[PDB]
Write a protein that binds this DNA or RNA. Structure first.
Ligand SMILES: Nc1ncnc2c1ncn2[C@H]1C[C@H](O)[C@@H](COP(=O)(O)OP(=O)(O)OP(=O)(O)O)O1
Ligand SMILES: [Ca+2]
Ligand SMILES: [K+]
Length: 430
DNA sequence: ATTTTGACGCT
């Protein structure tokens, strides 16, 4: 009891831009705003592959990974914006720069960990302490939380969505103990106030809307974020975890969406996160390893300790292209030309990165996939990255991979290459 | 024939 940790020591948010690439294109082209629309890369093969979908179009069943021709079958009036193409490949620069806009705004409020192009974790513990000092026992008005849901409420003894939201928020605020500055529920509530302010600032200064989760750790904040989308935020309190987890499929928890989550389900014969509480820590370590077992034992109780890392910039800068089916690279000239295209984009982005961020990459990673291999990467080799020069980087990549060619004819390449990948890594300050 | 990314763990 008095010594049992409860994982209530931090306030952590996860901010997720809503359908981000779509919003970037809608800001640029007002004709696309408030319409069913999607972002597509390439156009020749089946109308192009959809990579982002507005919520209006999701209502028709349009999803990412879908071909645009098929999406048009579900949504005949679907509007499309195309990813820019440069040097023969999709170029994501517009979205990376929009991401920087948002991340720099978020960084004014607190330390952020860039989780993806449109996702950041936020460590709010210190900001919440300061705001609590400013408030001086003053109660928190529901007006300060105009887009916040409290997971699990309302409960106990209106048929509209906003009415339910307000009822749950009212119950939560009515129960709060505003006089205890160490109260974890109060701390989460102040965190939610700050996140409302952050999201307002993002929308005012960029036009972009986002959703957010607020809880005591990254996994719960990420889970909370997806409960009420778009353009809303959700507070998941420690006390909400038993009911929330009691029907929560294991695969919905971050890092359990793949093979490990499948093995948890299969070996233990369970379906929901809460069922994990019935195993000892040693049982879980015996099945899943020391690290995973301890992590699951704590996580099914709502407890997780992974820190928000102070990192606003990506650790790697990479460029890749697939060559599916008939397009697989079968000559040496082809392989070298595409290595050159990838290296030119990489040099452009690296030079910009060096000027913006006072750092230099020192390692070049080359990855390839051969036709027939089911794995995404068949081979990975590295060489020194000593000059931001595309011809040198492409020549070096060719040198490290050229011995993979089985073909006895020098001009021909076999087995054909279905993927090329150049990644600059190992940054040092400059 | 999703494609193009990015982070981290194991050995
Ligand atoms: N599998 C993918 N392939 C290519 N691009 C992707 C892929 N997944 C995501 N992206 C890009 C496009 C998205 O706008 C952006 C953010 O991804 P993601 O958060 O999963 O969806 P989303 O922002 O489009 O919608 P949501 O509102 O549900 O968050 O990253
Ligand atoms: Ca998103
Ligand atoms: K996401």
């Amino acid at each position: 009891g008095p010594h049992m940790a409860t994982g209530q020591d931090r306030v952590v948010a996860l901010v997720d831009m809503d359908c981000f690439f779509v919003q970037v294109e809608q800001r640029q082209n007002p004709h696309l705003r408030n319409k069913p629309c999607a972002v597509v890369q390439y156009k020749s093969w089946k109308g192009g592959g959809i990579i982002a979908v507005s919520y209006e179009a999701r209502a028709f069943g349009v999803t990412r990974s879908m071909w645009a021709d098929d999406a048009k079958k579900l949504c005949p009036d679907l509007l499309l914006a195309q990813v820019r193409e440069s040097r023969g490949k999709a170029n994501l620069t517009k979205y990376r720069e929009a991401s920087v806009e948002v991340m720099e705004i978020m960084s004014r409020f607190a330390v952020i960990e860039r989780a993806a192009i449109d996702e950041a974790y936020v460590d709010l513990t210190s900001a919440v302490q300061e705001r609590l000092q400013k408030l001086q026992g003053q109660p928190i008005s529901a007006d300060l939380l105009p887009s916040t849901y409290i997971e699990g409420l309302p409960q106990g003894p209106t048929v509209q969505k906003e009415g339910m939201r307000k009822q749950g928020l009212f119950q939560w605020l009515d129960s709060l103990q505003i006089d205890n500055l160490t109260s974890p529920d109060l701390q989460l509530t102040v965190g939610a106030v700050i996140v409302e302010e952050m999201r307002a600032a993002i929308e005012r200064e960029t036009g972009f809307q986002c959703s957010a989760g607020i809880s005591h750790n990254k996994v719960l904040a990420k889970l909370a974020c997806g409960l009420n989308k778009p353009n809303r935020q959700t507070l998941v309190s420690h006390g909400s975890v038993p009911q929330l987890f009691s029907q929560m499929p294991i695969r919905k928890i971050r890092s359990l969406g793949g093979k490990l989550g499948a093995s948890v389900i299969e070996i233990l014969g369970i379906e929901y996160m809460g069922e994990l509480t019935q195993f000892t820590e040693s049982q879980l370590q015996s099945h899943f390893g020391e690290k995973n077992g301890s992590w699951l034992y704590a996580m099914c109780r709502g407890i997780e300790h992974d820190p928000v890392k102070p990192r606003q910039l990506p650790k790697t800068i990479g460029c890749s292209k697939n060559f599916p089916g008939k397009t697989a690279l079968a000559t040496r000239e082809q392989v070298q030309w595409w290595l050159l295209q990838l290296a030119q984009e990489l040099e452009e982005r690296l030079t910009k990165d060096r000027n913006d961020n006072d750092r230099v990459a020192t390692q070049l990673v080359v990855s390839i996939r051969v036709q027939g291999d089911k794995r995404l990467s068949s081979l990975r080799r590295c060489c020194a990255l000593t000059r931001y020069d595309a011809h040198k980087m492409s020549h070096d990549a060719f040198t490290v991979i050229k011995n993979c060619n089985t073909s006895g004819i020098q001009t021909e390449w076999s087995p054909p290459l279905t993927m090329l990948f150049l990644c600059a890594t190992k940054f040092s300050a400059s």
